[PDB]
Symmetry: C3
């Protein structure tokens, strides 16, 4: 009986694993995930960049990053309002990098941006990035609060 | 070795438990749950209060209860139509109580309400409570059908 | 030792089964599944009929099928755009059948449809069906791309 029960629990475990995989697949689908496309999700809450990174990390995803015009539009649509992007120049001023490492391969900066502005009064300049009107990018204070949009693999 | 096999399966189970918790957190996030805020959800189905309590309990949740003006607005936005609240004066006419216990702390009654109206000729007065698109409360018959909105802990 | 651990593992597995069922129930509820009604879900992606079938099947559901005017309205509500239905006459031209088997009963064809049109130039006639804007049906090429909408049991 002991070995028979053990073999059954292995089957129970494998069955639950496939069932949870199905649950995740269905959830992604109902939330709009498209075939061969990473999917962006948000709870529409505004918060400082540090909280956005922690929260997406907690969800096993990353802070949304547009790699091309298409993805930039996808993120804009999900957010509906201004959201943070996983891009910053905290490591080297003026040199924007993906929070997930590397130099930029695509950008959609607003005219006269990035300008590492200090006038906001929160302290320091501007090392974070958010997507504003018309999907254009603006460098903004990481201390500022904007929409949290997380990314999951295609 | 059965002991090793058993240890290995315990580990597999712990991983599934972690993945399921992740699934639950992502679902809430994708549905708009705010940090430190309660999670209100609805299927937009109107039904008698009895139905709503049973439904929310089945989901291990409870009928939505606004504890302040903020939450009242949040519930209003999710329901988008008239929704029952987890408040009734069924036990003792005149003394409204939370379905989860205790005397009302916050309220937002409409003018001329509660009137424990009997004119609905549906049987008895009005011992339940529902919200209107305006956000104000009105006592209504528990036998009437209104939107089901369940809440989950912050 | 061994037998006690096995008993606890059985218990751990059952609580996991229980929690997963609850996750599935909550997901459906939050997506709008009405009591005693089947529930329709879509990711708003357009794709050839064979892909829609494959996808719904992967999710343990089937391509949406309107069995009456109410369900037809429900499906158009969910689709928001032209979507394929689980109905075709691929087996025997002129005799529409449900993908899950059986001859078509309730129908809601647009005037002058079905017409097994060839002029589309995709090759062959029209053996699939899609619901357009207004809820009416049209036979269309199974090779054309339309919104994927899956249904799950009441
Ligand atoms: C939301 C936004 O774009 N803020 C920018 C700020 O980052 C800075 O560039 C400033 C320059 O004066 O202009 C503002 O409009
Ligand atoms: C939706 C609503 O407000 N219903 C109320 C009803 O509860 C009762 O108070 C009645 C007075 O006869 O007035 C109605 O307007
Ligand atoms: C979308 C739609 O209704 N397409 C139809 C097509 O199926 C075929 O019937 C054709 C014949 O003139 O008319 C088109 O309007
Ligand atoms: Ca079993
Ligand atoms: Ca900077
Ligand atoms: Ca700037
Ligand atoms: Ca009473
Ligand atoms: Ca009363
Ligand atoms: Ca009243
Ligand atoms: Ca335990
Ligand atoms: Ca045909
Ligand atoms: Ca046609
Ligand atoms: Cl900064
Ligand atoms: Cl009553
Ligand atoms: Cl065809
Ligand atoms: Na979900």
């Amino acid at each position: 009986a002991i070995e028979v029960k053990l073999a059954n629990m292995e089957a129970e475990i494998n069955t639950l694993k496939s069932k949870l995989e199905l649950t995740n697949k269905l959830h992604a689908f109902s939330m709009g995930k498209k075939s061969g496309k990473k999917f962006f999700v948000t709870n529409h809450e505004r918060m400082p960049f540090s909280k956005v990174k922690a929260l997406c990390s907690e969800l096993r995803g990353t802070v949304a990053i547009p790699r091309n015009a298409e993805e930039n539009k996808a993120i804009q649509e999900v957010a509906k309002t201004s959201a943070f992007l996983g891009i910053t120049d905290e490591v080297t001023e003026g040199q924007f990098m993906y929070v997930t490492g590397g130099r930029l391969t695509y950008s959609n900066w607003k005219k006269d941006q990035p300008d590492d502005w200090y006038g906001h009064g929160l302290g320091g300049g501007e090392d974070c990035v958010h997507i504003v009107d018309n999907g254009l990018w603006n460098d903004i204070s990481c201390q500022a609060s904007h929409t949290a949009v997380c990314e999951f693999p295609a």
